[PDB]
Structures are given as structure tokens and as C-alpha cells.
């Protein structure tokens, strides 16, 4: 289990010793990310640089030595005359000696332009708002109750959309301007503005357009003189500080049929069947380590089940959401979430909720735009829950009013969990392991939804879910990295489908049979195993090892995807660009070091000529017979807006994912090791005989009592 | 409770039916039990669902009570032309009319069609003993078991439908098994044709033998070629490979029992006769004997969803390299799909907490039989939240947390027909959301193993071939989205190519809202060549407070597609397999997509679905009944060894509100918790329910198995 210490995520101590040889380099003119000027040199992100696959199945496999360990450092070079990103690797760890250049990419111009947002920034866009929107206090006061400047608990706050701008290299970024209230995403005011804030004195930006209930206005004091002329035809809003905020999550109404008790509850007096230690989990079958990456989100690695490799690597790649809207800013909105630090913004699992109150909880460190490593108390979970459905049971019948026997294994699963909250949804990411060796990635959607103000044009492209409030139609669409190495690093990919035959019936041949036949398709190059989603997608995808079962057969995983998600974009078109791997619910690659990933920090802001585009893997059309090779899985969905989804999107019918499943892998049932089976026999003129391999148990325990914290520090 | 008009007969009603039928002399009426064909005797009695009009008059305008009566199926053998006839028995209490119903005029096949029994089986059993005795030395020698003074090492058979190749035959392959522990996965090689159309038992034949991929005539026949040695034969503690007894080791090892759930404060559910109450919903259930689970009257906040959701048929079609295997395409009604319901077992089939409740079924039996623990009604968590948001102030902390803890209703059955088990669960979640869903498990239809097996299958083991096969099952899905009369369109996005009205030199290409209205039926009739919208909906013309039409989504989770070419023989049995979803106007003459009748005669079944949309009827506004067909491709893998496992073989639909509900309608539960920060204190959490942390145990494990008269 140090072994998987190769795949761990950095700690308190790595991140401190990383920052300080950076700080020590006097010549990098290093200040804090809080520092309120963007013309400014800072370290914006630090997170674990896994080693090369080659070294690690060494060290695994082999017997070989431990790779040498790295850490990732984005700076922002804001602090010269032509600004940059510029990526280095940091080691070896312990003991920092080196910055490397890291994915460098010579004769990219845009790099400053592509960088995310920082709260110093926001902070600044705030300075420019309280100035740019003066001429407007009176009307905001007058339509809204609410202001920018002078205010207390009647703060005017902005949404940003991204992308910024129409062409690569721009930053202007239209703001949805909201009434700062409980569930504040819920409560636009008609006005939206365009801020160009590209260059690195904030005195320079500036507020370029106005969009107000339905009209471009030009600038601030352009809207301020119609208003003042009597020439607009204004929306005064309710004040909104009894009964809860519409946008509020506190109870209201009352069901038919009254509940006043808790409902039923998980409890674990024997302590967890899985071992977690560090990163590393064994259960049952299963071993397997995990990690956080702080960019991306969660993975899991050196998957094994039966002491034999399936996946090297299962990883969230992107999460995007794509609008369309009557607004400006509705439809502006393509959000990259790994463009805001997807796995940075696991907040903290509250137990019994989150997670069952008998979950292990982990707590992790990030600096992901901080002047220090910070604290994230219960960042992921990690527990087993019975599933309600039995893994396998049958009741053999003897027809005469009784049985020859009843044999079943209760369900479990053990479920690895973090979530993400980058702003108004949460995300919920789970890694799910049955005894059985079928492992499953899901994603269930929560939080509030993206909404802007209501007009009668807004109809078109969404749903009126309040007075003032439309909610935006919109698909989300996640890509997953499944580095497969079934059974070793070289696989194969083959499709199996039914296909009909007629034939004469050999017993009447005066008739015919018509019947299923099973048909095998092999793949050779990576061309033919990049399915487009107006392609037919086989029902049986596998990834096959030469290696055979007793039976003859070829040792495969399958894949099984679980998915609404379509082509949203034209291929081809702008800002498609960054997500190429959209077109593809299911593509195969060959395994190369430099295409280790579909996305990047950078993709959000500059769509248009990005670091990493995912078609550019399939342009080779390589060789994919016996090769190391990785699957690309896209899932999603179409979500169209709807009165229900108030205050909240619910989790119920709202998740995508895949599964993995044995296929020949084993020569029997794998969870048949389990000793939870139960097996219930006959006994003539007797009770029947209940045989177990492990006892019935009917013990209680009590979980520790509810505590949640609620922030996140520096320790 | 009004519930009642759905419920299922109890045993005292079904004595009474029995007893009224017996009573009448000339119908020279016989137990099922009697080991004779030539007999007339009651085969299935079950409550007959009376018309939609008077219910719905009953439940809604305060009228009288529907008349209660009986399904009484009749099989009547003891004639020159024996048929099977269907009688409404009634009133209950106190039967005293017996009416025909649904006559067939012209159709010829009625005796053939009929299901089989367990004294039909007992005949076929004492033929194959006289038939195989030329082969008793053929059987020892290759098997080690046989027919005749075997004891514990009998051979057995399992039967194969449907049964021979036109309407009007009773022909059935039979494989030849050792009957061992999961005797099913030991076929020996030998299959067997069996023609038993006569009521005289005496006259019934093997009429074609296979053996090992050849056809031999008969017994006699393949008994003298191995004699002369002219058959190429396949001669055939840990526990045996077909039982569930563990074996092998993780490399971690487990010696401890799992998690459990425990509910110290009882059910949160109100269960009264067949009518269950739960948060918002309100519905009834009821356990047909025939065709199987349903939920009646499904209203969540005081407003009817659907007045009908039920399991209409489960089919599995295969394919394979022997004639057995090529001929089976089995389809479960026609054995009593909701006759099967064997006990379940607390803590492994349904949580030690559930709620288990027993029914009476009168399927081919000498009386109504007791079946224990037939279905269970329990709340489980799901272990992920309805909803949660974490509310980040950006600056280190927070402005709240708010979560609710995920919880389901479930309401479950079982159907174990013979080899494979399947779970059908509704499921009712707190928001208004409701799921049916199908679970796989149990053994799976396999033939013996040569290479030409190959081609419609996987070898499994050293004799045994898992055939390629589909399952699919159809539902009725009669929605009534706040009342009887609604539309059905559905969303779509399309994508606009605009000037960008703040850089007009640029373009916005973009996501608008594409609405489809359907008028006529075949509009709606979606087959799996064609595209299926991601918005599927049902709606009234009531409006909710932001203007838009009260509905319910259908969102369905299936891997199934056309398996039978359309038009082709068998293929008339399961036209509904040709749709995904199909959207019919309601008729009393449509409430089945199938019968007990289709299995045993697919070329000339009793209802065609297909037919329900001939007349193309407008569905503008009115009682329209949604039809759902979900199912999966089934490759056998050595993994399905000894039995086919849950995980990823589920299928099944979600019903959604789509604006139904002015906000969310779990905003009413008072298991929410929000907690907020306070100024140099800690955390106040908030809670409308106190903070439970109490265990208690479940009862003591127990299991009957036998299924009895009372
Ligand atoms: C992005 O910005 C970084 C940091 O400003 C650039 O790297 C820096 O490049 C400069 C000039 O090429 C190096 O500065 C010094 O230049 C003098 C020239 O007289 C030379 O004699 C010194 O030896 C030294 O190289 C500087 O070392 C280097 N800084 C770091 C931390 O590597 C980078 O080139 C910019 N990227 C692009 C693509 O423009
Ligand atoms: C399977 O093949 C058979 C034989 O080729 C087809 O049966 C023939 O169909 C045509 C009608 O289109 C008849 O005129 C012939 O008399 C039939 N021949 C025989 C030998 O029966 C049959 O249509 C095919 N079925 C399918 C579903 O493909
Ligand atoms: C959240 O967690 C932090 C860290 O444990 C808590 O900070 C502690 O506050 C208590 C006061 O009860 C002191 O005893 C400790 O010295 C504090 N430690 C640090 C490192 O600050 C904090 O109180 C918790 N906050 C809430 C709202 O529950
Ligand atoms: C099926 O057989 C039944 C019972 O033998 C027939 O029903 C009888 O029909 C005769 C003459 O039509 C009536 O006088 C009897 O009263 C009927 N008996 C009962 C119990 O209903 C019936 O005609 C046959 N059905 C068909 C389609 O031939
Ligand atoms: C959206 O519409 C615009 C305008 O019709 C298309 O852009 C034109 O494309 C042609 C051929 O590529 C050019 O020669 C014209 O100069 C373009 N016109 C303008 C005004 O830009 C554009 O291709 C369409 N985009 C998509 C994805 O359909
Ligand atoms: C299964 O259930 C039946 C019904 O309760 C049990 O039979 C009863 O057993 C008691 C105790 O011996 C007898 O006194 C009664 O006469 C039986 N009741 C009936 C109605 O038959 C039976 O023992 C149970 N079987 C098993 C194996 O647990
Ligand atoms: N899903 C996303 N990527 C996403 C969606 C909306 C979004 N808008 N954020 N706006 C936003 C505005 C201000 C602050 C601040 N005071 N620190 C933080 C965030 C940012 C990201
Ligand atoms: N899925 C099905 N419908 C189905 C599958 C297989 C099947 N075969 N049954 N064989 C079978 C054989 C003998 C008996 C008896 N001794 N009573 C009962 C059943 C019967 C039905
Ligand atoms: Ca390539
Ligand atoms: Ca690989
Ligand atoms: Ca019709
Ligand atoms: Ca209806
Ligand atoms: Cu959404
Ligand atoms: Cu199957």
C-alpha cells in the first residue's frame, strides 16, 4: 500500500515545500494570489505531475525503482511587458531542486488571455462595476431596492459567463447582474453588461455595452439618460427582504400523508469490509488507488480485480454546459468546468446527507488560487451501502408446492465520492466497485440552475420558472479517460452484435427458421472505433486481451454507457474546437505520454485555439491491434428547464455514467468467493436448514452526531 | 378504502368462485391434479378489473361501487372438440352468474393454444420413460443417470416453446438434463420431439430424436447405431459449478457481515388493504395472476398521474445451434407470469426492514394457494442526495449548506418461471418522480456444447453453450396527468445561426426550444429505426403559475431493438416489440398487449398489438395509455456461471413531472437540514425533524419455501 503513494495526491507539507523554492527564486518577483493588481507575478496553481506509465508499471510490475516525484506549478507572469502562463515541474520530492519547462507550447500568443479568473479579479471587476455603473444608482435603487455602491445587506452582485469574447486572445465578459439575496442565482434584474478587462491595469477596463429587459444601450450613462427621459420601459422588482424565499431551500407546503420521523438508516457495528489506507483501497476483489487531481477531479488507478490489472487509469476529463438564450449573456454561456478548477472546489460532505453517516471521511489540500496550501475538511467519502437488490438469487422450485432449495448473496457496493461546486450547481462524482468486478462512474446533478431575466423571447430558448426568471435550455456533457489495460497493457478492441440468418428448419424442412446468430467485429486502426453519434453504437463494446478462459473464450471488459447526450455543436465550427471530444460517445486511442488529456485549465477562455484538441488523436488513424489503448467515453444530457427544477435540480433521473463489466475475464462468477451467500435447503418432517459461511448478525451501533464546519483554511 | 375495487381476490373469494363453478354440475368439472388431458377443470380464477367509466365515477363522483367479479378460465377437455372458454364470475360475494366472454369465431387452435400444466408435464414425464427404455444402456454409459430406477441419478427435461411450426400443434423440443443442483446448466447432448396434441396421453410420440449435432428418428434408431458403434458420444468435494456454494479467494478477504439498514421509528409509509400512502403519493397495487405487478390510481399531492402501470408481457428470444435452442422464444404470461411470485427472503431479496406481505393465487392448482412474502413494500436510502448545494462565500467559507437525504419507496415482486429470476420493483421517490424497473437474475436457458454452438452463443463450460438471446418486456403505462384527458408532444433542441447582436461582423450559433405536437396515433407510434426525442411528455391543458402545460416526462432506460423481422410467423405474437413507445387512445377492447394464450399459439394470437393502431385514431385531448417496451441483448459470458447477476441488467422508465408542480414538490418534506453560519459562535444547524441516531434490531432470519392451501 506505500506503493500507491506513486498515485497520491500532494500533502500540506509537499505544497508549502514546493511554494517556498518558488518563493526562493528571488528572480520570478513572486507576489500572493490576494494581491489586487493583475500586473503581477504568482504561482496560481500547484498540484501532483504524475510519472510516466512506462517508469510506474516498472516500479509496480518489475520490481523497479520508485519514479521520481513532481509537482505541477502554473505561474501567471503578469509582471512584464508582454504577459504569460508559463507551466514548470517541480522536484524531485522531497527536497525541490529543479523548475522544468512544462507543456510548452512556442508560438502561442494568447496565453495571458486564456488564463481562468482569480478572486483578485473579481475584486477588481467589482472596483470597475461601483465606478462604470454610477450613473445608473438612482435606477437601480428604483427597479431593484438594491445597489452596488453604499450598500450593506442590499448588494447587487454579477454572474460571469465564459467564454470572453468572439475570437481567441479577448477578455470581455458579459456579467448577469443579480439582487444579492438566499439563492442570489435566482434573482436577475434585467440588466446584463459587457467588461472588457483584458489588460493588466484595471483602470483601463471598461463597460462596452449594456443589455436592459430586452435593448442595447451603449453605456451606463446612455441607459441612465433614457431612464431619466422617461424613454424605458423599466421592471421594478418586489422587495424580497414570512413564508421562505422562493429561492430558499427551507420547508414548505405539507404532503398529504404527514412524516414527522426519521427515515430508515444505515449502521455499521462491524466497522468497514474495505481497507482504505493513505490512497490505496482494497475490497473483496478489489484493489485500487485514488487520487484528487485539483485541476480535473477525481481517478482511480491501478485498478485490480483478482490480483489481475483492468484499468491503469479511470479519470473525469471535462464537464461542460452549453446554452442557448434570448439574453446576450444566455448566449454567450459555454461553461468548461476544468477551466475554474473542477477538483479545487470539493466542498465539504455532510454525513447522513452527502454521504451515509457510517462513510469514511477524507479530507484533502489544495492551492488553487490561495496564497497558501488550504484545508478541505471531507472532501470525499468512501463506504459500502447495501444496494436493495440482491446481487444473484433464485428460488429452485420442485413444482409440487415447495423447493429444492433458495440461494442468494445480499447487494453491496462500495462507492468512492467527491463532489464539485464551482458556482450555482453540484456536481456529485462516484466510482461504484461490486463484488462481482463490475465497477461504474456516475455523475448526478444538483444545485441551482444557470437563469436569466424573463422576457416573452426567452420562450425560445427555455422555460419561465418564476415572475422574473427564465431557465435556459442547455445540455451537459462530461468526457471520461478509461485507460483500460485488461489484463495486462496490450488489448484489442471487438464489437459483438445479432444478426439474423434463414435458414431451412433441419427437423421440417418444408419450413424455415429465421433466428439470432452472434456476429464479431474486429477493429484495426482508430478510425474505425471512433463512433460519432449518428453512428449505430454496438451493444457489446469490449476490450479483449489475447489471453483466453478456460472455455476458449478471449479475456474482455466491456463498456456499457449510459447517456441522452448528441451532437450540441457543428463539428468544426469556433468555439467546437474545445470540445471535439463531444462528437464521440465512444472513442479508442492509442496510449502516448502527450495525449494524456481531452481538456485543460485553458480550454474555458480561449476555446477557439486551445492547448489540447481531442480530433487531433484520431488524425493518424493509428495501428490499434495488440496496442496499449484508452478509451474516451462521453455522457451527458439535454436539460430543458422546468418549474420543478425550484430552488433546485434534483438527483432522481438526473445522472450519467458508464459501467465496466467482466466478459470472459473470469471462468466463473467472481463474487462467488463472497461469503455472504446464503443458501436455505429442505429438510424432510423438519425446519428448514439455513447454511451461512459467515453469522447472522443483528448488532447495532450509533454514528457520532452531526457536525459540519463549513470552512476551508490554510493549516 | 376505495383502493378495494383494485384489489386482488382473497382466498375466501376464490373458494367461493371455485365453489359456485363446482356446483354446477354439468360442467363435469376435475381437479387439475387428475392425470388425464380429457377433463374439464377451472385453470385460472383472478379478479377481473371492471370498466374505467364506473371506476373513475366511483373514485371521483361519488358513485356506487363496480360490480366485483371473477376471471374464471376454463379448460374443457372432456368433449369431442375441446376448447378453452373465458367466464366473468360474479357478483362478489355471492356468485351467481357465469358469462363467456371474448369469442373467437373461426379460430380453430383454442385447445393448442392453452398453457401447460403440471399433470400435463407428469404425462410427458411417464412417455419419455417408455420411449427412452431402448436407450436405458445408451443413458448409463454416457451419463451415468437415467429414466428408470435412477433415484439420485435421474435424468430430467425442460421443455421449449413454442411448440411446433404452425397454429394448431403441440410439438415440443425437450433437453435432456442431469438433474443435479442447478440442473439446468447439465444438458447430456440428447434433445427430444414430442408430439402431445391428444387428449389421450396414450397416443402422444417422439417423433425425432437429437443427439450431439445429429437427427436419429427415434430412440430405437440412435439405440441400434450406438450399438453399433456407429454415434460419436460424449461420455460426461468442492462444490459442483451450477451451485451458489462459495469457492475461491479474494485476495482480501471479507469474514464480516455488511452494512444494514435499521428502522427503529417503523414505516414512514401508511399500508391499508392494497393502498399505500407515502409523503405526497397515494396509490393502489394490485398482483395479477397472469400478466403481474401494477399500480393503480397513482396520485402525488391530491392529483391523479396515471390511473395504470403495469407489466404486460416478458418475452426471451434465442437463437441456437440445436433444435431446442433454435425453436425457443418464450414468453411469460403464458405461464403465469404473476403466479410465480416465491417467497422472499428477508435481508437478501428486500431489506430486514421491509414490509412483506402474502397473497392467494389460483394458477393450475386443486385449491388457492398461500403464498408467502409474494411481495415487499419498503423505504430504502439511496445513498445519494435528493439535493444539495453548498452555498461558497468565496472567501474561505460559506453563506449554507442545504441537503436532503435521498430516500425511495419501493414496492417489489419476483417472477421465477423456471430457470430465471426476475425483480420488478416501482419506485417512488419523495419529488414526484416514479421508476419502474426489471432486474436479471437467476440461471440462465443453455444447450450443450459443440463447435457450431459457436455461432449462437458462448461456451460456458465443458458441455454447455449460453445461446444468444433478447429480453423484453412490455408495460402499460395508462397516465392520466391531472385527469383523463391529455396531449402528447415532445422537445427537442435545434441549433439557430444568428448575427451576434452586440458584434454584428460575428454569429451566435446556438440552442432554441423545438416543440412537436401529434395528432394522430401513428405519429406517435415510434419504432426503433427511427429517432427517439430526448422529451417525451404527456400533458394536460391545465397551465401551471408561470404559463406553461402541467405534465409528466417519460424517459426510458433500455438497450433493446428490433429482434424478429416485421411480418415474419412468431413475429405477430410481440408486434409491441416493435416500439419503443407506442401512444394509444384508450379502449376497453385494448387493455392487454398480450395473452396467456400467445406462447403456445404465436401465428394467430387473441391480440395483435399492432392492430390497436390500425384505425389511427386523434389523440388531441383525450385518454391516451402509453406503451413501453424496454429490453436487452443477452451475449451468455463465463461470468453468468452459476447465475446471472443483477448489476447492469436492469431496465425499465422514469416518469417525471415536467412543470406539473409550481416549485419542487419535495419542498415540503421536513427532513431538510440547513446549516448557517453564525458570527464568533458555531454553526446553527437547522432541522425541522430531530436528529435520530437510534438502532434496533430487525426480526430473526426465517424462510418457509413451501407455497400451500390454507
Ligand atoms: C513568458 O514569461 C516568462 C517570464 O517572463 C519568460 O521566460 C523568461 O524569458 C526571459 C527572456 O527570454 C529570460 O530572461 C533573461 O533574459 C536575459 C536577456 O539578456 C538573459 O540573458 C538571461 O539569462 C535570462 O534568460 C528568463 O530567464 C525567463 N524566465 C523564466 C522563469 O524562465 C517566457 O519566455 C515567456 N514566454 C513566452 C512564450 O514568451
Ligand atoms: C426466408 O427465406 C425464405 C426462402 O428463401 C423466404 O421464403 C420465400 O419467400 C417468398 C415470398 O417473398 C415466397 O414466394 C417463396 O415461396 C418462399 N420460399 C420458401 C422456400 O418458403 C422467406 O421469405 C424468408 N423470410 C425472411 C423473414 O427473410
Ligand atoms: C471549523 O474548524 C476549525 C478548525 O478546527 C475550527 O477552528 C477552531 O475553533 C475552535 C473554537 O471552538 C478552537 O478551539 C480552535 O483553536 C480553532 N482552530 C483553528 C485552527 O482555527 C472552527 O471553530 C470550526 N468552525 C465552525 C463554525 O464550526
Ligand atoms: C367450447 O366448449 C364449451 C363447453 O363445452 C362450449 O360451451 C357450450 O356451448 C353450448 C352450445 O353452444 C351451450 O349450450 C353450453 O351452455 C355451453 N357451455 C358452457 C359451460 O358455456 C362452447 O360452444 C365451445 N366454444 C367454442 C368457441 O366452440
Ligand atoms: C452561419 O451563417 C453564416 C452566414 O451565412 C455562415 O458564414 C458564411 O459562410 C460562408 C461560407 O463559409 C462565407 O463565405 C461567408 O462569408 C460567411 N458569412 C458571414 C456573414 O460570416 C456560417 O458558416 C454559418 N455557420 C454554421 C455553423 O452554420
Ligand atoms: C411453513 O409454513 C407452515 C404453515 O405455518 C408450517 O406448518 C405448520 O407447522 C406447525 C408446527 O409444526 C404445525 O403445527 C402446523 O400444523 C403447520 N401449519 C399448517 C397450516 O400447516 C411449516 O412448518 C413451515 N415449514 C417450514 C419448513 O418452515
Ligand atoms: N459552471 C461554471 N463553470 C461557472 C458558472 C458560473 C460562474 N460564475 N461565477 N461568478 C462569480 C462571480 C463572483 C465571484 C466572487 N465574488 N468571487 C465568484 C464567481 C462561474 C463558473
Ligand atoms: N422462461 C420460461 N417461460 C420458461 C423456461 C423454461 C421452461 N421449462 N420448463 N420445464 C419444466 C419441466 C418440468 C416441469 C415439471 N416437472 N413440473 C416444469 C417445467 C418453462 C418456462
Ligand atoms: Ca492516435
Ligand atoms: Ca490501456
Ligand atoms: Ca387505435
Ligand atoms: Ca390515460
Ligand atoms: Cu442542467
Ligand atoms: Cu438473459
Same mark, same amino acid.
Given at each position: ?9 500532494? /500533502? ?165 447582474? #443579480? ?78 400523508? %404527514? ?39 477525481? #481517478? ?11 484499468? =491503469? ?80 438469487? &433464485? ?41 462481482? @468486478? ?8 444538483? @444545485? =441551482? ?11 425560445? &430558448? ?61 477493429? /484495426? ?24 478462459? %478456460? +472455455? ?17 455543436? %457543428? ?19 492509442? =496510449? ?78 467472481? /463474487? ?8 436455505? +435447503? ?24 452531526? /457536525? ?8
Amino acid at each position: 500500500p506505500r506503493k500507491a503513494g506513486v498515485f497520491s495526491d500532494l /500533502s500540506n507539507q509537499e505544497l508549502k515545500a514546493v511554494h517556498s523554492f518558488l518563493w526562493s527564486k528571488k528572480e520570478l518577483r513572486l507576489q500572493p494570489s490576494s494581491t489586487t493588481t493583475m500586473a503581477k507575478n504568482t504561482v496560481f496553481l500547484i498540484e501532483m505531475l504524475l510519472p510516466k506509465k512506462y517508469h510506474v508499471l516498472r516500479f509496480l510490475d518489475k520490481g523497479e525503482r520508485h519514479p521520481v516525484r513532481e509537482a505541477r506549478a502554473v505561474i501567471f507572469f503578469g509582471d512584464q511587458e508582454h504577459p504569460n502562463v508559463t507551466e514548470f515541474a517541480v522536484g524531485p520530492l522531497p527536497g525541490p531542486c529543479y523548475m522544468r519547462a512544462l507543456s510548452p507550447r512556442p508560438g502561442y500568443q494568447s496565453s495571458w488571455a486564456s488564463r481562468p479568473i482569480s478572486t483578485a479579479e473579481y475584486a477588481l471587476l467589482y472596483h470597475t462595476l461601483q465606478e462604470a455603473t454610477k450613473p445608473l444608482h438612482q435606477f437601480f435603487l428604483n427597479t431593484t431596492g438594491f445597489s452596488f455602491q453604499d450598500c450593506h445587506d442590499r448588494c447587487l452582485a454579477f454572474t460571469d459567463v465564459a467564454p470572453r469574447g468572439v475570437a481567441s486572445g479577448q477578455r470581455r465578459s458579459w456579467l448577469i447582474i #443579480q439582487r444579492y439575496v438566499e439563492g442570489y442565482f435566482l434573482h436577475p434584474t434585467g440588466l446584463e453588461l459587457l467588461v472588457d478587462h483584458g489588460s493588466t491595469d484595471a483602470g483601463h477596463w471598461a463597460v462596452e455595452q449594456v443589455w436592459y429587459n430586452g435593448k442595447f444601450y451603449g453605456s451606463p450613462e446612455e441607459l441612465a439618460r433614457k431612464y431619466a427621459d422617461g424613454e424605458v420601459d423599466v421592471v421594478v422588482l418586489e422587495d424580497p427582504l414570512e413564508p421562505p424565499l422562493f429561492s430558499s431551500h427551507k420547508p414548505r407546503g405539507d404532503f398529504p400523508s %404527514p412524516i414527522h420521523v426519521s427515515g430508515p438508516r444505515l449502521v455499521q457495528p462491524h466497522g468497514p469490509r474495505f481497507r482504505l489506507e493513505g490512497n490505496a483501497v482494497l475490497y473483496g476483489g478489489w484493489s485500487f488507488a485514488f487520487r484528487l487531481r485539483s485541476s480535473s477531479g477525481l #481517478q482511480v488507478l491501478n485498478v485490480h480485480f483478482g490480483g489481475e490489472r483492468i484499468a =491503469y487509469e479511470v479519470s473525469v476529463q471535462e464537464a461542460v454546459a452549453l446554452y442557448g438564450g434570448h439574453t446576450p449573456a444566455g448566449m454567450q454561456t459555454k461553461y468548461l468546468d476544468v477551466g475554474w478548477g473542477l477538483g479545487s472546489v470539493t466542498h465539504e460532505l455532510a454525513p447522513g446527507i452527502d454521504c451515509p453517516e457510517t462513510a469514511t471521511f477524507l479530507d484533502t489540500f489544495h492551492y488553487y488560487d490561495a496564497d497558501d496550501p488550504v484545508h478541505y475538511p471531507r472532501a470525499l467519502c468512501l463506504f459500502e451501502m447495501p444496494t436493495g437488490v440482491p446481487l444473484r438469487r &433464485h428460488f429452485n422450485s420442485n413444482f409440487k408446492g415447495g423447493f429444492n432449495f433458495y440461494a442468494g448473496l445480499k447487494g453491496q457496493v462500495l462507492v468512492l465520492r467527491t463532489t464539485s461546486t464551482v458556482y450555482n450547481y453540484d456536481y456529485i462524482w462516484d466510482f461504484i466497485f461490486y463484488p462481482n @468486478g463490475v465497477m461504474e462512474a456516475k455523475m448526478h446533478a444538483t @444545485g =441551482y440552475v444557470h437563469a436569466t431575466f424573463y422576457t416573452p423571447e426567452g420562450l425560445r &430558448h427555455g422555460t419561465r420558472l418564476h415572475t422574473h426568471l427564465i431557465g435556459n435550455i442547455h445540455t451537459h456533457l462530461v468526457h471520461y479517460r478509461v485507460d483500460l489495460d485488461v489484463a495486462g497493457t496490450k488489448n484489442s478492441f471487438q464489437t459483438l452484435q445479432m444478426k439474423l440468418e434463414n435458414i431451412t428448419n433441419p427437423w421440417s424442412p418444408r419450413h424455415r427458421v429465421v433466428q439470432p446468430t452472434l456476429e464479431q467485429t474486429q477493429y /484495426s486502426w482508430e478510425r474505425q472505433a471512433a463512433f460519432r453519434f449518428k453512428r449505430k453504437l454496438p451493444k457489446y463494446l469490449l476490450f479483449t486481451s489475447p489471453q483466453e478462459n %478456460p +472455455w476458449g473464450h478471449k479475456r474482455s471488459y466491456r463498456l456499457q454507457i449510459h447517456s441522452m447526450a448528441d451532437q450540441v455543436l %457543428p463539428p468544426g465550427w469556433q468555439e467546437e474546437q474545445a470540445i471535439t471530444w463531444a462528437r464521440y460517445p465512444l472513442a479508442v486511442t492509442k =496510449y502516448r505520454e502527450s495525449e494524456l488529456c481531452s481538456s485543460s485549465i485553458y480550454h474555458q477562455n480561449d476555446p477557439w485555439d486551445p492547448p489540447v484538441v481531442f480530433e487531433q488523436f484520431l488524425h493518424n488513424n493509428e495501428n490499434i491491434e495488440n496496442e496499449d489503448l484508452v478509451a474516451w467515453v462521453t455522457v451527458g444530457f439535454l436539460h430543458i428547464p422546468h418549474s420543478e427544477d425550484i430552488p433546485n435540480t434534483a438527483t432522481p433521473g438526473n445522472s450519467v455514467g458508464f459501467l465496466l463489466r467482466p466478459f470472459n475475464f473470469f471462468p466463473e462468477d467472481p /463474487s462467488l468467493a463472497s461469503r455472504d451467500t446464503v443458501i436455505v +435447503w429442505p429438510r424432510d418432517n423438519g425446519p428448514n436448514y439455513v447454511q451461512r459461511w459467515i453469522p447472522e448478525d443483528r448488532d447495532c451501533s450509533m454514528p457520532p452526531p452531526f /457536525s459540519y464546519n463549513g470552512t476551508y483554511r490554510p493549516v
